Design a binder for this molecule. Structure first.
Ligand SMILES: Nc1ncnc2c1ncn2[C@@H]1O[C@H](COP(=O)(O)OP(=O)(O)O)[C@@H](O)[C@H]1O
Ligand code: BEF
Ligand SMILES: [Mg+2]
Lengths: 210, 50
């Protein structure tokens, strides 16, 4: 069973599934431990379990695989990974891992990883032969990002202005200087829509702090 | 001729053998669930019972 499947489900569907399983009232507690308990049940009676997420190394040597829908937070949803993986496949902080998991046995409360199926959407064999980050040779912007869609709606013109004010390409550093109440929120929203519409091949991430 | 003398050698050997069979039962109960290419023969045996 995939974790991301129960992840993209709303809380009501998790409640309905837990009541279909015939257990203690699960709607009472967190989505986190809701998914935890329904997974524990369905894994008591079910296949191999599958999961995916991003890995963070702890100072104890082990690692935690967490979900972005929980914004990479600590909780029962996390997947425990042993340092033996971080020696065999030499895992790293921030690796997109997807693999098989099982329920925790006596005294344990974190799902244990079984076998890594995809490391950063790629082969673990090919996960060894990789290049280091700061060891790379940086360069200036070579390929430009097309933000103009060509339809000219009420908001698309905004992006068009950028295309004639400050062109952006892959590898460029953009800094927005704006006082409060200036309309930067939907500015980033329109930019994200345009770059997601024009380039569905590059993985796009946003960050909202406070 | 019927009474045998024992020294520190085989006495310590027997005590180490008792510790060894203890940790061997421990690591055998542990390995009964282990799988392939998931552990090194370092944490399988505990140094504390020896
Ligand atoms: N592209 C646009 N087209 C029309 N109105 C816009 C556009 N961008 C911003 N606005 C106006 O600006 C306001 C944005 O408010 P808000 O998102 O709170 O700005 P900020 O996030 O900078 O405080 C809205 O009332 C909206 O009418
Ligand atoms: F306070 Be607003 F988002 F500029
Ligand atoms: Mg805003």
């Amino acid at each position: 069973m995939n974790l991301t499947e129960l992840k993209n489900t709303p809380v009501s569907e998790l409640i309905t599934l837990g009541e279909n399983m015939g257990l203690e009232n699960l709607a009472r507690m967190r989505k986190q431990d809701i998914i935890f308990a329904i997974l524990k049940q369905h894994a008591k009676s079910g296949e191999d379990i599958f999961g995916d997420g991003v890995l963070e190394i702890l100072q104890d040597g082990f690692g935690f695989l967490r979900s972005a829908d929980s914004s990479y937070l600590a909780g029962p949803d996390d997947i425990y990974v042993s340092p033996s993986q971080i020696r065999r496949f030499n895992l790293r902080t921030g690796d997109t891992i997807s693999g098989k998991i099982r329920p925790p046995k006596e005294g344990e409360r974190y799902f244990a990883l079984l076998k890594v199926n995809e490391v950063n959407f790629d082969k673990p064999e090919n996960a060894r032969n990789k290049i280091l980050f700061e060891n790379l040779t940086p360069l200036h912007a070579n390929s430009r990002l097309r933000m103009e869609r060509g339809n000219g709606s009420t908001e698309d013109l905004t992006a068009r202005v950028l295309d004639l004010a400050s062109p952006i390409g892959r590898g460029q550093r953009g800094l927005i200087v704006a006082p409060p109440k200036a309309g930067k929120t939907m500015l980033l929203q329109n930019i994200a829509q345009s770059i997601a519409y024009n380039h569905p091949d590059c993985v796009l991430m946003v960050l909202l702090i406070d | 001729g019927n009474r045998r003398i024992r020294s520190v050698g085989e006495m310590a050997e027997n005590q180490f053998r008792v510790g060894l069979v203890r940790v061997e039962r421990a690591v055998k109960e542990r390995l009964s669930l282990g799988d392939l290419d998931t552990l090194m023969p370092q944490d399988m045996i505990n140094a504390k019972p020896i």
